[PDB]
Amino acid sequence: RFLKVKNWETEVVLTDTLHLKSTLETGCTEYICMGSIMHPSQHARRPEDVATKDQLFPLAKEFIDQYYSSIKRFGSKAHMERLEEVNKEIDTTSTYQLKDTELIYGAKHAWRNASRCVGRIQWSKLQVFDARDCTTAHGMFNYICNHVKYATNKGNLRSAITIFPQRTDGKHDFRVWNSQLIRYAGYKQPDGSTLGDPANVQFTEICIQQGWKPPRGRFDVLPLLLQANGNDPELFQIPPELVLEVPIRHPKFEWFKDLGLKWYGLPAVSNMLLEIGGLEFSACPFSGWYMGTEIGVRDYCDNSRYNILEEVAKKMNLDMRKTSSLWKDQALVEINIAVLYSFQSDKVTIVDHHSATESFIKHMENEYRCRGGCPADWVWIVPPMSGSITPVFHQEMLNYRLTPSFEYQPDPWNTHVWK
Amino acid sequence: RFLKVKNWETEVVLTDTLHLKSTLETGCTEYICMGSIMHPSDVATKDQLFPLAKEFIDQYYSSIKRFGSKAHMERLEEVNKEIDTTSTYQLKDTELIYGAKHAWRNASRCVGRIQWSKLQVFDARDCTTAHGMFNYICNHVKYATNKGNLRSAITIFPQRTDGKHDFRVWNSQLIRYAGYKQPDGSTLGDPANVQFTEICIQQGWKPPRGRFDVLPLLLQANGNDPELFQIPPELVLEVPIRHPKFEWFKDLGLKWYGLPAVSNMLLEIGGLEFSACPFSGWYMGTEIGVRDYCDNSRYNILEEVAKKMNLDMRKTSSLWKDQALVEINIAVLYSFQSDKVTIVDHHSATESFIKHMENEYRCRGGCPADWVWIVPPMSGSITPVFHQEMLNYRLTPSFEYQPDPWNTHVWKLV
């Protein structure tokens, strides 16, 4: 009925009661902790495809209850009517439709509840685009182009989510097949090396197999591969003037520009599922702005990604014979300096890991003060470099699953039956 | 039943069955994870002790391929008699060695466990006085230090009886530097040790009031009041920190000690509790260079190093802290290696741990591991453990936390 978390740097202690409202399993038990498992749990709130009434209505009522509680009604005329309305809708279609206010509330609370996101101090400043009238992949492309243009905003980035029609029977899903709206292709080379982004090799081959003509470069913006109402997906080229990119250079190393590195400005996750009141929105691309380490540490320096540490260390004239010279650590810092300096030079929104983690601590305090807790996944929140010199490293966190939420979902090529 | 862990860099999958053998709590529930909680939330009765002892003896005889043997059954017989008649029992030397090694093997927060089976166990269960403890600890330090060629070792003092006669080393490690709070609010030496430094001074220690004073040993035998002892200085190996490129780094006056020797934990074997069990290995560089030197509440040297580096400290996004952190850690490693004092960098150490993990899953069915502690405090994702899924569970024998002695000791003098 109370769990404390301590900050070992400041000795601030916070007391969590929000976890009493947690809905589904974390994967852990009294005897085993799964805190570093990427997908520890298959506990879902509704089964399979179209639920029965007693499966869907309880989840709808819980969400509608929560929304009307949040606005200081509950039991109000409108709340009770809304319940009866959802009841008849489920009775007569096996599903129900969210009001615009409920949709906005649900999307913001899914972000507020995302325990792996260090950026949630921003959660209530989210632009919600209702795309539930969409019917074809051409319409999805139009909605996505507008999202990208609004969110990019000539570099002054703005958080947004575009929400396509919810799942019905499971055979008419709307899906963005891309993992992010904007990523670079990867190509398997004949000798066995990889050109471009190795993580995207499989998705790139699907695009090529669907007729995409690849330029076969290191930074080829992938097409959109969009699926509407369960049909076969269709390819679309994002107008390049909508794709803001930042050439990476270094404030001291004149030679850094000659590595030919660039990255895109808009991080826009498009493969997750948005769950609100038992409704599943299988296409719901959302975007914010980057923390530098996402590009500078993971995208650039993961061994299975662009893996650039060896090349940077060379130009730096570092001793690479032994691990203990820390040549990887030293190149890693310089790369992240360049990423930040380049984005900032071009006035493209970006946040460094010191500022972001500091904001998150402030967000945690805010959430404990007003909400009685903040679900947080230490394994994901602590940045992938310089961990203990950021404040979150020293902050204990409780992780639990609240709804509405963002969920993982299978890649659609593993499940789609082609027509 | 099986649980799978995946490495997201290599796609290697490992199957854990060993978790079925755990019976002590992690702190998590089915609906909350407390994996980042440092300390998630007293003498056993006869009835409590019997099953704990059986489980240990069973696993010991299993490990030596004599489960079910006559020797196995007579040992269980003998143990139960001792509990029945004395309310406790005594480990054979072989079981003590096995138990100590396996508490190490089971330490989910230790990245250095590839070495677990090479541990020198010093049986100090005949000790009766603080003078005896000092002698045992001096010999441990000398053996472990080995002129820089460090060797892992543990020294095990008598087990708890009624809880009123505990053996305790009051120090948190055998070798640490003092900390002194100044009148003006500043701190000289190690801020983490200010409280224990004050206790020492109160007990009669005359402090030099320098930045790197090796603390005296504060030793408690049989539940008596603890007594002060000065470790002979020639047994305390230290490394002056210099940098391979920055000639000014040596002018910072930094040094550290070579032997990491944890002395405030409790060793639990077969339900028996060894409250004084100091153990030592060798350092991973980041322990000194990231935490001891750069934690804001420790020596906190980032500012001074970055100044000497002429870094721009006006904005955080210059990553001046990150830049200075790396150079400090280069200096630590270079200094120890130059003086031929054993040390391991975080890249080598985490690679070894991955190989140790694989091996443990193959020969033992798993390896409990605390990702939050195993991942080094700098350069996290460029080490292989970052990408390694891990399962955390509590196996016994184990090393456990215990309260600080000055919070529970009832003083006997005057």
Ligand code: HEM
């Ligand atoms: C506005 C600035 C934002 C910043 C700086 C930020 C930062 C981050 C970072 C660094 C991660 C870890 C990414 C990784 O390692 O793969 C993350 C994850 C995540 N973010 Fe945010 N974020 C922002 C906005 C948003 C928005 C607008 C949403 C949703 C509406 C969101 C939802 C999520 C979710 C669900 C995850 C977890 C993804 C997963 O489990 O794979 N974030 N965020």
Ligand code: HEM
């Ligand atoms: C031989 C080389 C060894 C290396 C390189 C090593 C490495 C480490 C490191 C880096 C930590 C984390 C320290 C911290 O962040 O505070 C740790 C923790 C730990 N080590 Fe090892 N270690 C070694 C030997 C040993 C030995 C010999 C034992 C016991 C016999 C041991 C038992 C432990 C335990 C119980 C912890 C957890 C401490 C806690 O929770 O505060 N280690 N080790």
Ligand SMILES: Cc1cc(N)nc(C#CCN2CCN(C)CC2)c1
């Ligand atoms: C909105 C947003 C802002 C930001 N700064 N980063 C991200 C991200 C990411 C990285 N994805 C997360 C989703 N996962 C399925 C794959 C990896 C998202």
Ligand SMILES: Cc1cc(N)nc(C#CCN2CCN(C)CC2)c1
């Ligand atoms: C044997 C050993 C080798 C090594 N490289 N590091 C350590 C440590 C530590 C840090 N202590 C651990 C005990 N905890 C109570 C406080 C913090 C120990």
Ligand SMILES: C[C@H](O)[C@H](O)[C@H]1CNc2nc(N)[nH]c(=O)c2N1
């Ligand atoms: C195994 C481990 O959980 C996995 O590598 C995680 C660790 N922490 C992470 N943290 C973030 N922000 N992003 C990630 O992709 C990961 N990967």
Ligand SMILES: C[C@H](O)[C@H](O)[C@H]1CNc2nc(N)[nH]c(=O)c2N1
């Ligand atoms: C709050 C968090 O659990 C705490 O800061 C931990 C994080 N991981 C750690 N990891 C190691 N090796 N040592 C530590 O002291 C800590 N501290």
Ligand SMILES: [Zn+2]
């Ligand atoms: Zn857990």
